[PDB]
Structure formats: structure tokens, C-alpha cells
């Protein structure tokens, strides 16, 4: 068969004599989208000889089919059915009123079975090791958190088994792929406060620290532009094809702003219902709220020519195809104005579901404000850790309170839905609700990890802190050596979820092993 | 115009009325080759209207043109002329006896001018720096030698300005590209003796040293197979497309054999016309001469099916096209027998001049014998350095003697010619004369470098010893990051020697700077 991954075969038999049919397909997860032509089914030449057409339908989400008379342009019937991968289905259209009935010729496969088995195998190894062991300065929980984010990042970037829930969301919502980048920004803010407090307490000058901050930011941005962004398999670099934004550029700009702000308003940590960690940094909070107001004003009030004001949508076929070139609204307009199309990301995640043609950069200029807000919430987590380190109860109470406040803000902004909130969660736009949701997740993760790993010591963070102590080396390495063996080899079946998943799991485990080897040899690179 | 790099335009005007012409081209540097059809020139339809044909001729070497009547298959005239790059030439064939006259319409460019200017600029910088400075354990000469080889290797591997004399020779002879690999084998043998003598004098066990040797050899071979050989821009690795031989595999096998031999017959260095450094290692010499006899016997006496015995030729169109699939003779036959075609090098250097279709691996199985002989001559250089270190005169006398003996052997074997000796110099075959020639070069280089750098100290080896102390890092790095900026960018003219040369010089200078930075930070990787 010619079915690709996540496709099903749909045979359409038209038993109507005097009506040609057009089949329109729509995904249930494509919001306010247009129907697209699936296949044209000619009329039956004679009674008893139904004309037949075959099409491939995507099986990742539910499908909506609309059969339309191609001359009268009126609807004969409609189906909403969830096809299964590699299934063989038939749709018969017959008189007596026109009734279309769907039949299953060959049953589909269970496409999520490899993930179910992989989790069971991983759980079995965990229990066996934990049971077997029973018979026989630096905060470890932050390293554990950063290493969990790194392991998820390596699994997702290498393919995620080609599963849609291990890829980035098209426009709105969350998948597993969308969680780790905000967590990196959060952890980097926490590390900003921890490192700077230690350095300034030891007696270092503020200008020497300023030079160190500037050097680190410059070097992060340069590595992102020159080493990570370009696809050098396509050919030598030309300026007109150079993408300026990116992941490390975002981290460098965010690090510079937040670190300089902390340095400029730095205070010694003093020596319990108190708000000292909040009120001692009120200039920081005022500047952060002004930046957030700037993001909201630009997102909702800046007029974009040939586009609605306050547009939060993917363009393409979405929003009923009314704004095909409006992917991003103000964010995309500001990117295209200051940098130009050719210096932006050319493969936005909305292209596959909404068929967008314009270039949109997820790490663009406008979302750096919300990136800074995420890093500053991480700074607050570090402030809690250092202000109340003598009291575990105080730290846990404050982590719980921040998690609850940010979760309530997320509930209010999103209305607990993918597309219907005032500000729906969106990684491409780096929305405010995106930041509050992932920040409440991060505060809860720390609420669990701090007492287990740092205070009680029931768990040492293995094997997560090994890459967490070599994050920049792991990141740049997995970018440089993505196509190399043993991370990537040729598969016997490229349309198999099982083979892709096995390959991606093996490559992630290899990066964990590399980080462990570097830890044992005491080789640590800090950018 | 549609002239590529190193092409000239040749317009052929046939003023003959009753003879069609076929133009055959042959390079003067293609040995015993066949003529190939250049262009067909129809007869002149009427007197005063000569038929015209245009062709492109390569300008790297001299050309031989033969104009043949396509019906009578007899020669009308013949030219041997050296065309210039981007020149515009005309060849007029007319009656009165048929005389063909060559005329120059547009003069060619001086293609070697960028190299002439680059050397003058480099010399000017050297004199300016040396003049300016006048106003204001580890052997350094071996590091200087290894760093010179590394700088040449990086320049050549990145393109060499696309100049033919900075590329590998097609089959026989030497260019600048063909010098550095034997020098690496020689230096590695010298380092084998120096390192092993120090380790065994310090009191280490021979089995611990054996384990270290085995680990280093295994790791070199693995890096060569997995990291250097594959082109991962083409796609994920499949076993049937994996090249087994290579540069680091050759170094690993040679290192294992020579290091184990030295370890097994190791003797303490004792404390002047004496031959102690030669007679104390007579078992090594006997085994090396037996291996050399094996190479000669296999090269000249092994019958290769469908091929002459003792064949030292490229196949293809060479040797008058008689043996088109005999590229390599016994060496290629042994490679194709033990490994198969698909695991060999698919782009041998003979393909462009001799049009060979079979795969030949320059780092194949049979030439490992001569690789071992080269490394053992390096071991002898190290023996001279350590046995007579108290006397500079003894070291210089012995370096001179070895250089002269190996040079005389090279003269006898090659008869001072490219193709007419008993064993002509050939890097693809790793010939005996190749090894003796490059070994005499290496002994002369050491004869010059040792007193200047190590004894008198007139020169410190700058800037050559910086990469010489990080050779494996420089090699693997320039292989991994070849396509990256700033080593490679898009050129305004891809048919320009000047732009290619400037790019390659800049990339080589960048690798020297990287090695200097690693030296200043005391970061040294020893495989
Ligand atoms: S792709 C989408 C996801 N993006 C990525 O994966 C991008 C990759 N980014 C990263 O790995 C990181 O965000 C980095 C490397 C850019 C920055 O990591 P950070 O969290 O800022 O910390 P990093 O390890 O670099 O060290 C920063 C400082 O914090 C300190 N620090 C880090 N972790 C801890 C900890 N757990 N406890 C105490 N101090 C810590 C370090 O000592 C260092 O201080 P120093 O300069 O005085 O020695
Ligand atoms: S592409 C065609 C060209 N091919 C290449 O460029 C391949 C690249 N190959 C290379 O760079 C080298 O041949 C290598 C890295 C494989 C081996 O380099 P070597 O010459 O064997 O020496 P290397 O620097 O690795 O060190 C080997 C030993 O010799 C010693 N050594 C090296 N140079 C010197 C010196 N000048 N003086 C004293 N000892 C030295 C080292 O200390 C080391 O001993 P140790 O293990 O006790 O510390
Ligand atoms: C299929 O035909 C139906 C007709 O029932 C179309 O639905 C109508 O579309 C028009 C737009 O031209 C609307 O004004 C109507 O409100 C729709 N409903 C009805 C009941 O008329 C439908 O658009 C057609 N499908 C496609 C893809 O064009
Ligand atoms: C899907 O199932 C149908 C059966 O409903 C298959 O149709 C058969 O096709 C073969 C050859 O193509 C014919 O010999 C049979 O007569 C068909 N049966 C019917 C009932 O039509 C169809 O081939 C299947 N599609 C696949 C396997 O891709
Ligand atoms: C061009 O024609 C000449 C004829 O002068 C060919 O040279 C002869 O080639 C035959 C082979 O068929 C030899 O036996 C003769 O000895 C050659 N010389 C003479 C004087 O006859 C030449 O081979 C032709 N060129 C090509 C490319 O075929
Ligand atoms: C090489 O030089 C000849 C001159 O000998 C060029 O021929 C001229 O071509 C132009 C247009 O193609 C004609 O208008 C002239 O009449 C031609 N002159 C002669 C004397 O034939 C030829 O174009 C040149 N080839 C190039 C520049 O590629
Ligand atoms: C400091 C915080 C709270 C506020 C910062 C945002 C303010 C200063 C700015 C940012 C973008 C601005 C908007 C940008 C453009 C327009 C369109 C124009 O036709 C009317 C004004 C209006 C609608 C502006 C109103 C003020 C605005 C919202
Ligand atoms: C130890 C050194 C000096 C000599 C080693 C080489 C000897 C042992 C071997 C290596 C390859 C061998 C040759 C390989 C194959 C043939 C073809 C056969 O029809 C006759 C013997 C002959 C011609 C062999 C003669 C001996 C030979 C030359
Ligand atoms: C997100 C799914 C990917 C699963 C990755 C599994 C990694 C397991 C670690 C393997 C290597 C451990 C080495 C450290 C031993 C102390
Ligand atoms: C084979 C031609 C290539 C020319 C390479 C020139 C390299 C010159 C060195 C430049 C960097 C020097 C850094 C060390 C300073 C002490
Ligand atoms: C169906 O389409 C064909 C053209 O392919 C057309 O000739 C025919 O008339 C159409 N059917 C009806 C009922 O009009
Ligand atoms: C030249 O070739 C043509 C075919 O292209 C042929 O017709 C003609 O006869 C040939 N010239 C002579 C003199 O035979
Ligand atoms: C390390 C190896 C990881 C393999 C995990 C399991 C892959 C999925 C198997 C599913 C079989 C139906
Ligand atoms: C030890 C001297 C302290 C004096 C004030 C230092 C201020 C540092 C922050 C300056 C911010 C400048 C933005 C680029
Ligand atoms: C006394 C030691 C001073 C060390 C360097 C301090 C100056 C660096 C300032 C960088 C500012 C960059 C702003 C874009
Ligand atoms: C002492 C070293 C100073 C290095 C300065 C480098 C330039 C500063 C660039 C960082 C700013 C990036 C975000 C605006
Ligand atoms: C020295 C005490 C001054 C207190 C000023 C008020 C601080 C208010 C902080 C606002 C924080 C808003 C986000 C939680
Ligand atoms: C696709 C919809 C996403 C909405 C996410 C918001 C959930 C609210 C979080 C509540 C607090 C959780 C604490 C860990
Ligand atoms: C996110 C998953 C948390 C648990 C992972 C457990 C891995 C193995 C733990 C056993 C080692 C315990 C060391 C103290
Ligand atoms: C470092 C820059 C190296 C440039 C060397 C000169 C290139 C050739 C110039 C020739 C001009 C005709
Ligand atoms: C200290 C013990 C010395 C005993 C002899 C050591 C011999 C080492 C070389 C062995 C060669 C084996 C080839 C793989
Ligand atoms: C006493 C310490 C011993 C250290 C290891 C020695 C044994 C290694 C032998 C490797 C031989 C490989 C031959 C292919
Ligand atoms: C103590 C570490 C031993 C490692 C042994 C690795 C296997 C030996 C392979 C080297 C041989 C390569 C040329 C035959
Ligand atoms: C202990 C003295 C024994 C001497 C034996 C003869 C040694 C001959 C060495 C041959 C070397 C050939 C290549 C130069
Ligand atoms: C293309 C022909 C190459 C022949 C090379 C042989 C030259 C002989 C070397 C003489 C000794 C030189 C000492 C440096
Ligand atoms: C192969 C070329 C040899 C000479 C190169 C000279 C480079 C610069 C030398 C000046 C520095 C002297 C340090 C003692
Ligand atoms: C700050 C880093 C900027 C890197 C610019 C790269 C330019 C490469 C294109 C040059 C060849 C056309
Ligand atoms: C069919 C190819 C299987 C490749 C297995 C992956 C390699 C994992 C171990 C790598 C050790 C270097
Ligand atoms: C010693 C190193 C051998 C490496 C073998 C690589 C095999 C890769 C092909 C597997 C996928 C078809
Ligand atoms: C037209 C593009 C010119 C690129 C110049 C090469 C860069 C050399 C310096 C690199 C510093 C990182
Ligand atoms: C997704 C869990 C994978 C379990 C195997 C990890 C160890 C190689
Ligand atoms: C402690 C100084 C406060 C400066 C005003 C706050 C907003 C920048
Ligand atoms: C001096 C107290 C001012 C408080 C400002 C608070 C800004 C959020
Ligand atoms: C870094 C600025 C480059 C932007 C070039 C195009 C501007 C529209
Ligand atoms: C071939 C000599 C090049 C001279 C320039 C080297 C310094 C960048
Ligand atoms: C000192 C032992 C000599 C062994 C014979 C030489 C050839 C292997
Ligand atoms: C015991 C002396 C034998 C000499 C052998 C020489 C081998 C080249
Ligand atoms: C390493 C041996 C592989 C060779 C496979 C083909 C043999 C003809």
C-alpha cells in the first residue's frame, strides 16, 4: 500500500446516478478552518456499477467529511469519524433521501501501542533497580529539573517517535514538546539569582560582574546564530538566508536584561509570615509589570496593515481563511518589519495544520518580553530558596502559594480551553497564559523536587542531574551531531512509529550516558 | 560565458568542403591515455562559409588535439598547445595539403596570480613582524613539524584554492596535497618511541602500557569509521554504504603494530661512530624487512583475475584503455575481495583524469605495510634523538645519513620520473618509493628544525606548535565543522581561484587561532 504514517485508506462508492460528488475533509482540531477537497467521485455510469474513488485521510485527530453535489453545490450528507492508522474503510453513497454509510474493511492498528509498551518497560526497570538496591553549595534539585528538561528536549528534537503529542502544537494548546523551553528560562533565572548572590557576597565588583554578564550574553547569541540555526547540509551560508532569531539568542537577550536588572538593584540576603523577598525587589517588579503592559498593548492595540487589530490567529486556512497572511498578528508584523521575511523561521509549526505560507519566527522580538517575565519568575523562585533556606516549611509554603496564584491567572486567561480564552496558551506567541501556566508547573515541580532531593535526600536525582550539570554541552552537542551514528541510522520502515520511537529513545539514552561520562571525568563547560 | 574554472573556449572553423572532422583531446599529463571526442565539426556547406563548432578545453595542463576525418578515419593534422584559463581561441582548418592554424582571440588570465600575491603578502608580514621584534621534556621541533603538517592539511582539505597542485595527484607523482599524511605517520612513530621510553623508564608495567596502546588504537579506528568517513548530509547511515578504511583507521592499525613491536622488544637507552640505535633493534628491522618483502611479493607476483600480474596503473582510459577495471592491481583486488566495492572509497583521485569507474580505497589493506614502514622510520628518528641527545653533532650526522640513504633509494626506484621507474611514486598505492621519498623529506625537515628550534632556540616554532600540540582536536574539528561559518560561506563567484583561495587561507588561519586559544587555556586532548 501507499499509506504513509498516520494515514488511512478511504474508498468512496457513489451509487447515485445523476449527481457528481465532491468530498471535503476537515480536521476536528483545526479551529474555524476551511474544508479542503479530498477527492472527486464521478457519478455512477449505470445502475449496479458504482463509481469508485480512493483517498488517504489523516488519523492523528478526528475527521469531518462533507459530501457536496458539485453542480448544485449543496450538501448530501456529512460524517464525523475518527479513522485509525493503516485502516481500510469504505464509504457508500446510495439513494434511500441520500444515505452514506461507513464500513470498516480492514481494522486499523493500535498506533499508540509502542508508547504504552515503552512506559511499561521503563517502569519495570525502575522498580527492578529500586527493589535491587533495597536488598543491597550546588542545589541538586535545580540540576535534576534542568536534566529532566534536557532529556525531554533531546527526545522531542530528535523526532519524538513521530507522534503528534511529542511535537509542537500547531497554533494553540500544549503538547509535551511545548513544556521544556519555558522551564529552561525559569531555571536560568533561578541560577541568575543564586550565582549573582554568591558572587556579590564573596566581594566581587559590580563592573566585573557586568562584564561577565555581557560576555556570556554575546557568546550565547553568537553560538545560536552561527552554529545552531543554519542547516549546513543545504549549502554554505549566505546573508540573505540567515535566520537572526533563535533559542540561544532568546536566552542571551533574556539573560542580559534579567541579570543586569538583578545586578543593578542587588541587595544582600537578610537573616515566618513575611514578604521580604517580594518587597525588597519592588523596582524589579515595577519594571516587569511595565514590560508586561507593553506586551499587552502591542499585542491588542497595535494596528497591523491589511489585518485585524488584536489578531491572535495562525492565518492560513484558519479563522475561515479570512486572513491568510496574518500569521502572528502584531508579533509577526514586528518581525517582518524589523528583520524581514528571509531572516525569520521558514517552517512555523502552523504550516501543516493551517497551511500558512508566510514565515513566522516563534523566537521573535515581541515574545522576548514574556521570556523576560518567565526568567524573572525563576528569579523569584531563587529568592525564596535563599531568603528562607533555614526553614523548609517557609520554602514549601511560598512555592505552593506562587503555584496557586499563577494557576488561577492561567485559569482566568484561558477559560480552561484551547481556543476560547481571552489569551489562549500559545508557544509561537509566547503568550502571557503560556508563561503563567508553565511557571505554575515549574513551581509545583520545585515544590516536589526540593524536599525529596535536597532536604530529605530520599533521591539523588539520578540520572537527571548528569546532563543538568552539562546542559550547554548537551544542547550544542545534540544540535551538531544530530545526523550522526549512533543517534541516527537508516530504518527498515520509515512509516513505523515503533522504529522511530526506539531510535529516539536510544539516542536520548546515549546523551544521558555521555553526560554521565563527562561528570565522572569532571569535565564541565559553563558558557 | 559558460566557461567553468580552468576552462578555455576553442572555436573550430572547418573550411574543408568534402571532409567532416572529429576533434580528439588528450591531456599531456594523462599517461598512455586514449583520445576522447571533443566536438564534431561538420563540413563547410559552401566555399566562403566555414562550418563552426565550439568546445571547452581544460587548461590545467597541456593539450594534444588530433583532427580526424570521420569517414576515412585518417589524421589531417595535430596540435600540442597549452591553453590559458578563460582564453578565447580559434582553430581554422583550411586547404593548402591541409593546414590548421591556431589563433588567440582574447588573451587568457594569469590563473596563478592569486598564489603569487598570497606568498608575497605572507612574506611581507613575516619580515615586518621579524623586523619589528628586533626593534623591541617535550621536543618543540616535533610539535613544529606536526603543526606545519596540520596547517597544510587544513588548507588542502578545504579546497586549496581549487588549484591542481594543491590537490592529490591523479595516479602517479607528487603534489603539495600528497606530503602531509606520510609526515603524520612518521611523527607518530617518533612520538611512539619518545612516549614509550619515558613511560617504561618511569617504571610502568608492560601490560598496563599494552592496555593503553590497545585502547588508543581501538578508539582511533572507531572515530575514523563513525565520525570522519560518513557524509551525514546525504542521509542516515546504512551498513551497505559504510566505508571501512580511512585515515584514522590506518593510523590506528599502524600505531598498534609499531607500538606493540617497540613494547615487545623494548630496551633502556644506554649512555661517536656507533650503530647502537640500529643494532639494538635488529628484531624490529628483521620483521620490517619481512613485511616489506611481503608487500613487494603481493604487489608484483599475486595474480589478479582478468588483469595483468604486477599491474601498477589506474585503469580507466590509462594504459591505452586496455584494463579499464584494474585500478590498483593487487591492492584494489585485495580490497574488493576482503571488503567489497561498497565499503571502499567511491571517489578515487584517478576518476577525473583517467575516468575510472571502479571504487578504489587509498587507505586500503595492502598499503598498511608501507604505512608501518613509514612509522618505523619515524621510530628510528626518535631513537636517534634519545640515544645521542648529549651530542648535537651525532644527531645531525645521523639525520643527514638517513636522509641521503633514503633519497638514493628513491632515485633508484623512480629513475627521477613520474611514470617510468620500477616503482613510481604513488600515494594511492602507498608505494615503497613514496615512503622513501617522504621519509628523506622528513629527515631533512628534522635536520633543519632540531638545531634551529630545540638547540639554539633562534625560533620557537610559532605559530606552528600551537596546532601541533592539539593535532587530534584540530583534525576532528576541521572534519566536523567544515561546512560551518566562518570556515565556509557562499562566494560571489564559484569559478574564481582568488575567492576560493582567500576563503581557504582564512579558514586555515582561523584553525591556527583556535589552537592558540586552546593552548593559552591549557586545554589539550590526547587520544
Ligand atoms: S531547544 C529548547 C530548549 N532550550 C534549550 O535547551 C537551551 C539550552 N539552555 C541551557 O542549557 C541553559 O539555559 C543555559 C546553559 C543557557 C544556562 O544554564 P543556566 O541555568 O543559566 O546555568 P549554568 O549551568 O549555565 O550556570 C549559570 C550559573 O548558575 C550556577 N548554577 C547552575 N545551576 C545551579 C544549581 N543547581 N545550584 C547553584 N548554582 C547553580 C552556576 O554555578 C553558574 O554560576 P557561576 O557562573 O558563578 O559558576
Ligand atoms: S587527513 C591526512 C593527514 N592525517 C591526519 O592529519 C590525521 C591526524 N593525526 C594526528 O593528528 C596524529 O597522528 C595523532 C593525533 C593520531 C597522533 O599524534 P601523535 O604524533 O601520535 O602524538 P600525540 O600528540 O597524540 O601524543 C602521543 C604521545 O607522544 C608524546 N609526544 C607527542 N609529541 C611529542 C613531542 N614533541 N615531544 C615529546 N613527546 C611527544 C605525547 O606526550 C604522548 O605521550 P603520552 O601518552 O605519554 O602523554
Ligand atoms: C457544500 O454545500 C453546502 C450547502 O448545503 C455549503 O453550505 C453553505 O455554504 C454557503 C456559502 O456559499 C453558506 O452561505 C450557507 O450558509 C451554507 N449552508 C447552507 C445550508 O446553505 C458548503 O459551503 C459547501 N461546502 C464547501 C466546501 O463549499
Ligand atoms: C480494502 O478492502 C477492500 C475490500 O472491501 C479491498 O477490495 C478488494 O480488492 C481486491 C484487489 O484490489 C479485489 O480482488 C477484491 O474483489 C476487492 N474486494 C471488494 C469487496 O471490493 C481493497 O483492496 C482494500 N484496500 C487495500 C488493501 O488497500
Ligand atoms: C585518427 O586517425 C589516425 C590515422 O592516421 C589513427 O591512427 C592510427 O590508428 C590505428 C588504430 O586503428 C593504428 O593501427 C595506426 O598505427 C594509427 N596510425 C596510423 C598512421 O594509421 C588514430 O587512431 C585516429 N584517432 C582515433 C582517436 O581513433
Ligand atoms: C571569441 O572571439 C570571437 C572573435 O574572434 C568572437 O566572435 C564574435 O562574436 C560576436 C557575437 O558572438 C560577433 O558579433 C562577432 O562578429 C564575432 N567575431 C568574429 C571575428 O567572429 C566570440 O564571440 C568570442 N567568444 C566569446 C567571447 O565567448
Ligand atoms: C506601561 C504599560 C502599562 C503600558 C505601555 C503600552 C502603551 C504605552 C502603548 C503601547 C502600544 C500603544 C498603542 C499602539 C498604537 C496605537 C494605535 C493608535 O491608533 C491609537 C493609540 C494606540 C492604540 C497605542 C496606545 C498606547 C499603547 C498601548
Ligand atoms: C619474507 C619476504 C622476503 C617474502 C614474502 C613473500 C612470499 C612469501 C610470497 C608473497 C606472495 C607470494 C606469491 C603469491 C602468488 C603466487 C602465484 C603462483 O602462481 C606462484 C607463486 C606466487 C608467485 C607467490 C610466490 C611467493 C610470494 C611472493
Ligand atoms: C523521554 C524518554 C527517553 C528515555 C531516556 C532514558 C535515559 C536512561 C539513562 C540511560 C543511561 C544511564 C547512565 C547513568 C548511569 C548512572
Ligand atoms: C598554507 C597557507 C595557509 C596560511 C595560514 C596562516 C596562519 C597564520 C596564523 C594566524 C593566527 C595566528 C595566531 C597565533 C598568534 C600568536
Ligand atoms: C460529472 O462530471 C462530468 C465531467 O467529468 C460531467 O460531464 C457530468 O455531466 C457530471 N455529472 C452531472 C450529473 O452533471
Ligand atoms: C558529414 O556528416 C553528415 C551527417 O551529419 C553526412 O550526411 C555527410 O555526408 C558527412 N560528410 C561527408 C563528406 O561525408
Ligand atoms: C533502549 C530500547 C528502548 C526500546 C523501547 C521499546 C520500543 C517500543 C516497542 C513496542 C513493540 C510493539
Ligand atoms: C562596584 C561599583 C558599583 C557601581 C554601580 C554598578 C552598576 C552596575 C549595573 C550598570 C548597568 C548598565 C547597563 C548596561
Ligand atoms: C574593573 C574591571 C572591569 C571589567 C569590564 C567591565 C566593563 C564591561 C561593560 C560591558 C557593557 C556592555 C553593554 C552593551
Ligand atoms: C569584558 C567582555 C565584554 C564583552 C562585551 C560583548 C558585547 C555585549 C553584548 C551583550 C548584549 C546582548 C543583549 C543586548
Ligand atoms: C521597603 C518596603 C517597600 C514596599 C513597597 C511595596 C512593594 C510591592 C511589590 C509589588 C509586587 C507585585 C507582584 C507580586
Ligand atoms: C489545553 C489547555 C491548557 C490549559 C492549562 C491550564 C491548567 C491550569 C493549571 C492549574 C494549576 C496546576 C498546578 C500544577
Ligand atoms: C521522574 C522520575 C523520578 C524517579 C526516577 C527514578 C530513577 C531511579 C531511582 C533509583 C536510584 C535512587 C538513588 C538514591
Ligand atoms: C587573510 C587574507 C588572505 C588573502 C590572501 C590574498 C588572496 C589573493 C589576492 C589576489 C588578488 C589578485
Ligand atoms: C611487565 C611484564 C612484562 C612481560 C612481557 C610483556 C609483553 C608485552 C607485549 C605483548 C604482545 C602481545 C600482542 C597483543
Ligand atoms: C595489570 C593491568 C592490566 C591492564 C590491561 C592489560 C590487558 C590489555 C590487553 C589488550 C590486548 C588487546 C589485543 C587485541
Ligand atoms: C584496557 C582497555 C582495552 C581496550 C581493548 C580494545 C580492543 C583492541 C583493539 C585494538 C586493535 C586495533 C588494531 C588491530
Ligand atoms: C647485539 C648486536 C647484534 C647485531 C646484529 C646485526 C644488526 C643488523 C641490523 C640491520 C639493519 C638493516 C636496516 C638498516
Ligand atoms: C615526480 C617525481 C618525484 C621524485 C622525487 C624523488 C626526489 C629525490 C630526493 C632526493 C633527496 C632530497 C633531500 C631533501
Ligand atoms: C616555515 C616558515 C618558517 C618561518 C616562519 C616565521 C614566523 C614568524 C617568526 C617570528 C617569531 C620568532 C619567535 C622567536
Ligand atoms: C553575530 C553573527 C553574525 C553572523 C553573520 C554571518 C554572515 C554570513 C554570510 C556571508 C556570505 C554571503
Ligand atoms: C540496525 C542498527 C542498530 C544500531 C544500534 C544503535 C547503537 C547503540 C549503541 C551505540 C554504541 C556506540
Ligand atoms: C566499529 C564501528 C562500526 C560501525 C557500524 C555502523 C553500522 C550502521 C548501520 C546500521 C543501520 C543500517
Ligand atoms: C562575505 C563574507 C565574509 C566572511 C569573512 C570571514 C569571517 C572571518 C572572521 C570570523 C570571526 C568569527
Ligand atoms: C520512555 C521510557 C524508556 C525506557 C527505556 C530507557 C532506558 C534505555
Ligand atoms: C531604588 C531606585 C528606584 C528607581 C525607580 C524604580 C523604577 C525604575
Ligand atoms: C516606595 C514604594 C513604591 C511601591 C511600588 C510598587 C510597584 C509594583
Ligand atoms: C539585523 C538587521 C537586519 C535586517 C535587514 C532587513 C530589514 C528590513
Ligand atoms: C599563503 C600565505 C598566506 C598569508 C596570510 C596568512 C595570515 C592570515
Ligand atoms: C630477541 C628475540 C629475537 C626473536 C627473533 C627475531 C624475529 C622475530
Ligand atoms: C643475532 C644477529 C642477527 C642479525 C639479524 C639482522 C636482521 C636484519
Ligand atoms: C568487516 C568485513 C565486512 C566485509 C563484507 C563483505 C565481504 C566481501
3D architecture notes:
Chain A has 527 residues and is of the alpha+beta class. Chain A folds into 2 domains: 7-106, Immunoglobulin-like (Sandwich); 117-136 and 138-520, no CATH class. In chain A, 47% of the residues lie in helices and 11% in strands. The first copy, chain A, has 15 helices and 8 strands. Chain A has helices at 113-135, 140-157, 180-201, 206-228, 247-264, 276-279, 282-301, 330-338, 351-354, 368-387, 392-414, 432-455, 465-468, 471-480, 497-520, and strands at 7-14, 21-27, 36-41, 51-58, 63-69, 75-81, 88-95, 98-106. In chain A, the strands form 2 sheets. Chain A has a 4-stranded mixed beta sheet, with no helix packed on it. A 4-stranded antiparallel beta sheet of chain A has the order 3-2-5-6, with no helix packed on it. In chain A, a hairpin with a 5-residue loop joins strand 5 and strand 6 (75-81). In chain A, helix 2 packs across helix 12, helix 2 (140-157) runs antiparallel to helix 15 and helix 5 packs across helix 10. The longest helix of chain A has 24 residues, at 432-455. Chain A starts with 6 loop residues before the first strand and ends in a 7-residue tail after the last helix. The relative contact order of chain A is 0.11. The A-B interface holds A 226-227, 230, 232-233, 235-238, 480, 483-486, 488-491 and B 226-227, 230, 232-233, 235-238, 480, 483-486, 488-491. Bound molecules: acetyl coenzyme *A (2 copies), a molecule of 2 linked components (NAG-NAG) (4 copies), cholesterol (CLR) (2 copies), hexadecane (2 copies), 2-acetamido-2-deoxy-beta-D-glucopyranose (2 copies), tetradecane (14 copies) and 2 more.
Amino acid at each position: 500500500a501507499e499509506l504513509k504514517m498516520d494515514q488511512a485508506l478511504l474508498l468512496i462508492h457513489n451509487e447515485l446516478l445523476w449527481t457528481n460528488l465532491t468530498v471535503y475533509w476537515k480536521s476536528e482540531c483545526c479551529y474555524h478552518c476551511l474544508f479542503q477537497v479530498l477527492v472527486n467521485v464521478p457519478q455512477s455510469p449505470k445502475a449496479g456499477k458504482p463509481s469508485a474513488a480512493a483517498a488517504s485521510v489523516s488519523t492523528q485527530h478526528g475527521s469531518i467529511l462533507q459530501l457536496n453535489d458539485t453542480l448544485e453545490e449543496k450538501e448530501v450528507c456529512r460524517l464525523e469519524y475518527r479513522f485509525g492508522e493503516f485502516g481500510n474503510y469504505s464509504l457508500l453513497v446510495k439513494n434511500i433521501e441520500i444515505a452514506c454509510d461507513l464500513a470498516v474493511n480492514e481494522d486499523p492498528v493500535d498506533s499508540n501501542l509502542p508508547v504504552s509498551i515503552a512506559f511499561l518497560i521503563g517502569l519495570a526497570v525502575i522498580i527492578v533497580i529500586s527493589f535491587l538496591r533495597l536488598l543491597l553549595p550546588r542545589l541538586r534539585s535545580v540540576d535534576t529539573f534542568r536534566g529532566i528538561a534536557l532529556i525531554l528536549m533531546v527526545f522531542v528534537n530528535y523526532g519524538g517517535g513521530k507522534y503528534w503529542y511529542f511535537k509542537h502544537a500547531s497554533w494553540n494548546g500544549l503538547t509535551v514538546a511545548d513544556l521544556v523551553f519555558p522551564w529552561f528560562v525559569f531555571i536560568m533565572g533561578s541560577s541568575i539569582f543564586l550565582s549573582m548572590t554568591s558572587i556579590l557576597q564573596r566581594g566581587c565588583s559590580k563592573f566585573r560582574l557586568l562584564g561577565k554578564i555581557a560576555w556570556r550574553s554575546f557568546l550565547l547569541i553568537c553560538i545560536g546564530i552561527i552554529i545552531v540555526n543554519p542547516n549546513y547540509c543545504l549549502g554554505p551560508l549566505s546573508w540573505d538566508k540567515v535566520r537572526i532569531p533563535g533559542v540561544l539568542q532568546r536566552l542571551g537577550v533574556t539573560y542580559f536584561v534579567v541579570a543586569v536588572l538583578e545586578l543593578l538593584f542587588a541587595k544582600p540576603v537578610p537573616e515566618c509570615l513575611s514578604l521580604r523577598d517580594i518587597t525588597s525587589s519592588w523596582p524589579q517588579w515595577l519594571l516587569i509589570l511595565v514590560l508586561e503592559g507593553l506586551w499587552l498593548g502591542l499585542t491588542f492595540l497595535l494596528p497591523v496593515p491589511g489585518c485585524p487589530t488584536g489578531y491572535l490567529g495562525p492565518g492560513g486556512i484558519g479563522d475561515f481563511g479570512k486572513y491568510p497572511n496574518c500569521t502572528g498578528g502584531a508579533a509577526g508584523y514586528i518581525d517582518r518589519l524589523l528583520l524581514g521575511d528571509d531572516h525569520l523561521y521558514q517552517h512555523p509549526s502552523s504550516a501543516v495544520l493551517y497551511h500558512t505560507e508566510v514565515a513566522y519566527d516563534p523566537e521573535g522580538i515581541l515574545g522576548t518580553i514574556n521570556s523576560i517575565v518567565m526568567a524573572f519568575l525563576g528569579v523569584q523562585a531563587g529568592k525564596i530558596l535563599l531568603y528562607y533556606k533555614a526553614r523548609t516549611k517557609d520554602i514549601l509554603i511560598r512555592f505552593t502559594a506562587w503555584c496557586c496564584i499563577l494557576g488561577l491567572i492561567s485559569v482566568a486567561l484561558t477559560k480552561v480551553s484551547e481556543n476560547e480564552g481571552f489569551i489562549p496558551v500559545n508557544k509561537n506567541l509566547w503568550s502571557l497564559s503560556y508563561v503563567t501556566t508553565l511557571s505554575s508547573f515549574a513551581f509545583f515541580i520545585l515544590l516536589v523536587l526540593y524536599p525529596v532531593v535536597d532536604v530529605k535526600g530520599l533521591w539523588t536525582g539520578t540520572p537527571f542531574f548528569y546532563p543538568g550539570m552539562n546542559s550547554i554541552l548537551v544542547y550544542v552537542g545534540h544540535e551538531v551531531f544530530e545526523n550522526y551514528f549512533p543517534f541516527q541510522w537508516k530504518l527498515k520502515d520509515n512509516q513505523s512509529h515503533k522504529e522511530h520511537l526506539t531510535q529516539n529513545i536510544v539516542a536520548t539514552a546515549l546523551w544521558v550516558l555521555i553526560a554521565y561520562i563527562l561528570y565522572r571525568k569532571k569535565i564541565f563547560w559553563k558558557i
